[PDB]
Write an enzyme that holds these catalytic residues in place. Structure first.
Site, PDB file in Angstrom:
ATOM      1  CB  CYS B  46     -15.989  12.153 -21.929  1.00 21.61           C
ATOM      2  SG  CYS B  46     -14.424  11.370 -22.619  1.00 21.61           S
ATOM      3  CB  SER B  48     -13.726  12.482 -26.179  1.00 17.74           C
ATOM      4  OG  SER B  48     -12.594  11.695 -25.828  1.00 17.74           O
ATOM      5  CG  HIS B  51     -10.695  16.267 -27.225  1.00 11.50           C
ATOM      6  ND1 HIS B  51      -9.959  17.165 -26.504  1.00 11.50           N
ATOM      7  CD2 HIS B  51     -10.174  15.045 -26.962  1.00 11.50           C
ATOM      8  CE1 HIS B  51      -9.038  16.511 -25.809  1.00 11.50           C
ATOM      9  NE2 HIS B  51      -9.135  15.226 -26.084  1.00 11.50           N
ATOM     10  CG  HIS B  67     -18.651   9.893 -25.983  1.00  8.29           C
ATOM     11  ND1 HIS B  67     -18.331  11.205 -25.737  1.00  8.29           N
ATOM     12  CD2 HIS B  67     -17.638   9.152 -25.455  1.00  8.29           C
ATOM     13  CE1 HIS B  67     -17.146  11.239 -25.116  1.00  8.29           C
ATOM     14  NE2 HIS B  67     -16.729  10.007 -24.886  1.00  8.29           N
ATOM     15  CB  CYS B 174     -16.747   7.005 -22.201  1.00  8.93           C
ATOM     16  SG  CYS B 174     -15.071   7.356 -22.911  1.00  8.93           S
TER      17      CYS B 174
HETATM   18  N1  LIG Z   1      -9.034   5.934 -26.080  1.00  8.45           N
HETATM   19  C1  LIG Z   1     -10.313   6.133 -25.657  1.00  8.45           C
HETATM   20  O1  LIG Z   1     -11.213   5.336 -25.902  1.00  8.45           O
HETATM   21  C2  LIG Z   1     -10.573   7.348 -24.846  1.00  8.45           C
HETATM   22  C3  LIG Z   1     -11.693   7.323 -23.899  1.00  8.45           C
HETATM   23  C4  LIG Z   1     -11.781   8.322 -22.930  1.00  8.45           C
HETATM   24  C5  LIG Z   1     -10.904   9.362 -22.976  1.00  8.45           C
HETATM   25  N2  LIG Z   1      -9.972   9.481 -24.017  1.00  8.45           N
HETATM   26  C6  LIG Z   1      -9.042  10.556 -24.038  1.00  8.45           C
HETATM   27  O2  LIG Z   1      -8.207  10.494 -22.882  1.00  8.45           O
HETATM   28  C7  LIG Z   1      -7.754  11.818 -22.525  1.00  8.45           C
HETATM   29  C8  LIG Z   1      -8.026  12.055 -21.061  1.00  8.45           C
HETATM   30  O3  LIG Z   1      -9.450  12.153 -20.857  1.00  8.45           O
HETATM   31  P1  LIG Z   1     -10.003  12.541 -19.422  1.00  8.45           P
HETATM   32  O4  LIG Z   1      -9.335  11.820 -18.366  1.00  8.45           O
HETATM   33  O5  LIG Z   1     -11.500  12.520 -19.547  1.00  8.45           O
HETATM   34  O6  LIG Z   1      -9.525  14.059 -19.447  1.00  8.45           O
HETATM   35  P2  LIG Z   1      -9.066  15.143 -18.379  1.00  8.45           P
HETATM   36  O7  LIG Z   1      -9.957  15.138 -17.191  1.00  8.45           O
HETATM   37  O8  LIG Z   1      -8.916  16.402 -19.128  1.00  8.45           O
HETATM   38  O9  LIG Z   1      -7.662  14.627 -17.851  1.00  8.45           O
HETATM   39  C9  LIG Z   1      -6.395  14.969 -18.492  1.00  8.45           C
HETATM   40  C10 LIG Z   1      -5.398  15.257 -17.388  1.00  8.45           C
HETATM   41  O10 LIG Z   1      -4.167  15.514 -18.063  1.00  8.45           O
HETATM   42  C11 LIG Z   1      -3.471  16.474 -17.294  1.00  8.45           C
HETATM   43  N3  LIG Z   1      -2.439  17.085 -18.114  1.00  8.45           N
HETATM   44  C12 LIG Z   1      -2.577  18.044 -19.111  1.00  8.45           C
HETATM   45  N4  LIG Z   1      -1.400  18.255 -19.648  1.00  8.45           N
HETATM   46  C13 LIG Z   1      -0.462  17.504 -19.014  1.00  8.45           C
HETATM   47  C14 LIG Z   1       0.950  17.354 -19.141  1.00  8.45           C
HETATM   48  N5  LIG Z   1       1.670  18.020 -20.035  1.00  8.45           N
HETATM   49  N6  LIG Z   1       1.523  16.422 -18.334  1.00  8.45           N
HETATM   50  C15 LIG Z   1       0.804  15.711 -17.452  1.00  8.45           C
HETATM   51  N7  LIG Z   1      -0.504  15.891 -17.262  1.00  8.45           N
HETATM   52  C16 LIG Z   1      -1.128  16.770 -18.073  1.00  8.45           C
HETATM   53  C17 LIG Z   1      -4.568  17.415 -16.827  1.00  8.45           C
HETATM   54  O11 LIG Z   1      -4.144  18.279 -15.780  1.00  8.45           O
HETATM   55  C18 LIG Z   1      -5.720  16.477 -16.517  1.00  8.45           C
HETATM   56  O12 LIG Z   1      -5.840  16.182 -15.138  1.00  8.45           O
HETATM   57  C19 LIG Z   1      -8.437  12.794 -23.465  1.00  8.45           C
HETATM   58  O13 LIG Z   1      -7.619  13.066 -24.592  1.00  8.45           O
HETATM   59  C20 LIG Z   1      -9.626  11.968 -23.981  1.00  8.45           C
HETATM   60  O14 LIG Z   1     -10.103  12.413 -25.221  1.00  8.45           O
HETATM   61  C21 LIG Z   1      -9.774   8.427 -24.844  1.00  8.45           C
HETATM   62  O1  LIG Z   2     -13.694   9.435 -25.284  1.00  5.81           O
HETATM   63  C1  LIG Z   2     -13.766   8.419 -26.298  1.00  5.81           C
HETATM   64  C2  LIG Z   2     -13.365   8.869 -27.684  1.00  5.81           C
HETATM   65  C3  LIG Z   2     -12.226   8.461 -28.331  1.00  5.81           C
HETATM   66  F1  LIG Z   2     -11.332   7.657 -27.749  1.00  5.81           F
HETATM   67  C4  LIG Z   2     -11.908   8.879 -29.586  1.00  5.81           C
HETATM   68  F2  LIG Z   2     -10.783   8.493 -30.225  1.00  5.81           F
HETATM   69  C5  LIG Z   2     -12.791   9.692 -30.256  1.00  5.81           C
HETATM   70  F3  LIG Z   2     -12.489  10.109 -31.489  1.00  5.81           F
HETATM   71  C6  LIG Z   2     -13.938  10.121 -29.651  1.00  5.81           C
HETATM   72  F4  LIG Z   2     -14.776  10.959 -30.323  1.00  5.81           F
HETATM   73  C7  LIG Z   2     -14.219   9.709 -28.358  1.00  5.81           C
HETATM   74  F5  LIG Z   2     -15.349  10.156 -27.788  1.00  5.81           F
HETATM   75 ZN   LIG Z   3     -14.973   9.451 -23.841  1.00  8.41          ZN
END
Ligand SMILES: NC(=O)c1ccc[n+]([C@@H]2O[C@H](COP(=O)([O-])OP(=O)([O-])OC[C@H]3O[C@@H](n4cnc5c(N)[nH+]cnc54)[C@H](O)[C@@H]3O)[C@@H](O)[C@H]2O)c1
Ligand SMILES: OCc1c(F)c(F)c(F)c(F)c1F
Ligand SMILES: [Zn+2]
Ligand SMILES: NC(=O)c1ccc[n+]([C@@H]2O[C@H](COP(=O)([O-])OP(=O)([O-])OC[C@H]3O[C@@H](n4cnc5c(N)[nH+]cnc54)[C@H](O)[C@@H]3O)[C@@H](O)[C@H]2O)c1
Ligand SMILES: OCc1c(F)c(F)c(F)c(F)c1F
Ligand SMILES: [Zn+2]
Ligand SMILES: [Zn+2]
Ligand SMILES: [Zn+2]
Lengths: 374, 374
Positions: B46, B48, B51, B67, B174
């Site tokens: 993922c 995250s 990150h 995770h 996730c």
């Molecule tokens: N809230 C939660 O529980 C949770 C769970 C899973 C993921 N996340 C977060 O969600 C985000 C996305 O995760 P993911 O899908 O696994 O990641 P990912 O595969 O990196 O997808 C992000 C997408 O954003 C695109 N992107 C980057 N910059 C821009 C921009 N300026 N404008 C438009 N598109 C852009 C990028 O090209 C990519 O396809 C990350 O920050 C994760 O940490 C949060």
């Molecule tokens: O991808 C899920 C995810 C989150 F949404 C968070 F806010 C975070 F801090 C983290 F560690 C994480 F794994």
């Molecule tokens: Zn996640």
């Protein structure tokens, strides 16, 4: 007879920011098609009117302000079907055109015909019905209630109960409905919940009224002016706190008092810092915070989006979320049926000629609502 | 044979930010009371987890990250009642203790036992089950799935269907559940609505899946990488837009495309600027915007609260708003009954030993999800 004729009457004209209203003769044109000319009976002094004076709100000047009011229809233009001469009415500072995507949406009320977002200070047709000393004078929010007579678009007026006491129900035109709706409709306060209300003026007291009506178990009033506390308790606050009394930030205080954050918080002041405080003090996973206050023009707040990511909801609303033309007559009817009280909001009643003294009472902290009588 | 004994196994240890993972032997202590030791079968990569590497997310180092995973229980500590040795399980990066005010709340899911808000990198008892080179190693979100064996608290594991394909269902830990729930549960997307999804990675694709399942009429995908568009359309996007193609800001473009703003927008990237853009592009009176992306550590966004005052709702959520232990087994059962698909998210498969290559695929833009097999 005045119908079809220019009326010369008294109004409170604001020629420039940060100066007193000038109480003087204006000319009020007759209503055009789909317009309504109203003889004003009572108008309230809302903090948002003061925002025009102070420059917190920007709108074209010179202007006839005033937006919380009630009066009697003097005449109607061609094509009006919803009010008639002699009807009691409340002007609607948020219109209800009935046709736009917002008006058609079940939860929207900020009709696209509003003059709030990008104020022109005119009738819907882009012109003014007011002249003073030979000069055109702007409208305010399609209402302009600080005048013995105004002209409003039909979409900006509602007919109300003929038996209504206008010196009370004018408050349904802004402060009561805004606060009450913010609690009951926008936040959707639940039975048994804990609420925090920032700002205990007319709008914040009406938020408390709504939280109590919704069955909240705890309602914490927050104000820097402790003189506001007694009336807050009278209308339902269970506790009041003054941030100035504490060494810690008040969001920490409120989080502690609520054993981990409140269910519902309301910003009813108009400050960027209290908007963020109010958000923070709601429970991080399921709390809701509603912005009611109007902040200073063109200023941005700063906040950490982790406050939202954990699960908080942040929203705002105009006029308590109420669809204005549908809701105002029903709120008046509910008042007449004793479903809520308005007297707790009214602290002063003055003749219209004392508008400046009324604004001074607001600015000093001494009033909740002054009602001006024509 | 291994019950009650330390297990030596391989894990991917992150010693320092901005460095490759080190695949090397660790010692995994046996589970204490109310803990569960799991033999991992599959884990996803993922964003995250990345990150943690990049310092976007701050958690104590050195650490075993991971995770999103699925495995089989090897042993249980004293007092465990909800899983047994041999059960298939998914670790829960958001716990469900069942006892705190959030767990008890009908909407809440961000259990107060989480290790996300203020990460300590430990078990619930404040200690670690991992040693490497004789040194204690931190846990991550109470899960630490980048290891052949992990130990989790009972509130951080759910038993799933014995017939489940673990190399697919790990995504319910996730990315799938996060995006799908963000649409269906958090935003509550309505039939016939217009949605905009910012970011078309695994989480954003799962948001699209949810918007389509909820009956949205239009689903506009937004990504700066046009290679993401084909899969977005396959899972339900009706149109895709690349902000880099336009002279105007994309909020203006999306407002135009939606004839005045979208019903629901989703930030699924993790940028402050796109959080504000996604808010802005939803309709000003009734729009809803959900933050899903994880922001850079300790940074604040700037925004004009008039965006909220008109009527917008802004919210965020962890794990799609799902109460984790209740929901994960049901989501697996629904997957088994073909109620949603996971294969569209899986673009690459690698052995666990090739974890660094899997992160390279994510960072290059090439993958959605790589699934690692132990
Ligand atoms: N809230 C939660 O529980 C949770 C769970 C899973 C993921 N996340 C977060 O969600 C985000 C996305 O995760 P993911 O899908 O696994 O990641 P990912 O595969 O990196 O997808 C992000 C997408 O954003 C695109 N992107 C980057 N910059 C821009 C921009 N300026 N404008 C438009 N598109 C852009 C990028 O090209 C990519 O396809 C990350 O920050 C994760 O940490 C949060
Ligand atoms: O991808 C899920 C995810 C989150 F949404 C968070 F806010 C975070 F801090 C983290 F560690 C994480 F794994
Ligand atoms: Zn996640
Ligand atoms: N959204 C709407 O439709 C709408 C309608 C009506 C009012 N308003 C706005 O709501 C706000 C309140 O209006 P009102 O009730 O008529 O005004 P008001 O009577 O001036 O009340 C504001 C209260 O805030 C208190 N206060 C000031 N600073 C602080 C502080 N730092 N901490 C705590 N309390 C403080 C102050 O003492 C006063 O009692 C104003 O900004 C109005 O413009 C918005
Ligand atoms: O008090 C109601 C009210 C508002 F909520 C505003 F946002 C505004 F701009 C205004 F002029 C006004 F009168
Ligand atoms: Zn309308
Ligand atoms: Zn007002
Ligand atoms: Zn809990």
């Amino acid at each position: 007879s005045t119908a079809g004729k220019v009326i010369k009457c008294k109004a409170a004209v604001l020629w420039e920011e940060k100066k007193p209203f000038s109480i003087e003769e204006v000319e009020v044109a007759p209503p055009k098609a789909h317009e309504v000319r109203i003889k004003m009976v009572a108008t309230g002094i809302c903090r948002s009117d003061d925002h025009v004076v102070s420059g917190t709100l920007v709108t074209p000047l010179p202007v006839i302000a005033g937006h919380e009011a009630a009066g009697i229809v003097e005449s109607i233009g061609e094509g009006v079907t919803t009010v008639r001469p002699g009807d009691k009415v409340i002007p609607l500072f948020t219109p209800q055109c009935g046709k736009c995507r917002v008006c058609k949406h079940p939860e929207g009320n900020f009709c696209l015909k509003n003059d709030l977002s990008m104020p022109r200070g005119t009738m819907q047709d882009g012109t003014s019905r007011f002249t003073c000393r030979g000069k055109p004078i702007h409208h305010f929010l399609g209402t302009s209630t600080f005048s013995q007579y105004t002209v409003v678009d039909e979409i900006s007026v509602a007919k109300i109960d003929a038996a209504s006491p206008l010196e009370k129900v004018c408050l349904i035109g802004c402060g009561f409905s805004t606060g009450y709706g913010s609690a009951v409709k926008v936040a959707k306060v639940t039975q048994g919940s804990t609420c925090a209300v920032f700002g205990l003026g007319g709008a914040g007291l009406s938020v408390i009224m709504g939280c109590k009506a919704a069955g909240a178990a705890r309602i914490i009033g927050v104000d820097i002016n402790k003189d506001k506390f007694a009336k807050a308790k009278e209308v339902g606050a269970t506790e009041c706190v003054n941030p100035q009394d504490y060494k810690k930030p008040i969001q920490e205080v409120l989080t502690e008092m609520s054993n981990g954050g409140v269910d519902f918080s309301f910003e009813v002041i108009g400050r960027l810092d209290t908007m963020v405080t109010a958000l923070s003090c709601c429970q991080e996973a399921y709390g809701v915070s509603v912005i009611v206050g109007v902040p200073p023009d063109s200023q941005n707040l700063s906040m950490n989006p982790m406050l939202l990511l954990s699960g908080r909801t942040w929203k705002g609303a105009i006029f308590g979320g109420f669809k204005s033309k549908d809701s105002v007559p029903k709120l008046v009817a509910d008042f007449m049926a004793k479903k809520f009280a308005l007297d707790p909001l009214i602290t002063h009643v003055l003749p219209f000629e004392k508008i400046n003294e009324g604004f001074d009472l607001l600015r000093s902290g001494e009033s909740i609502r002054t009602i001006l009588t024509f």
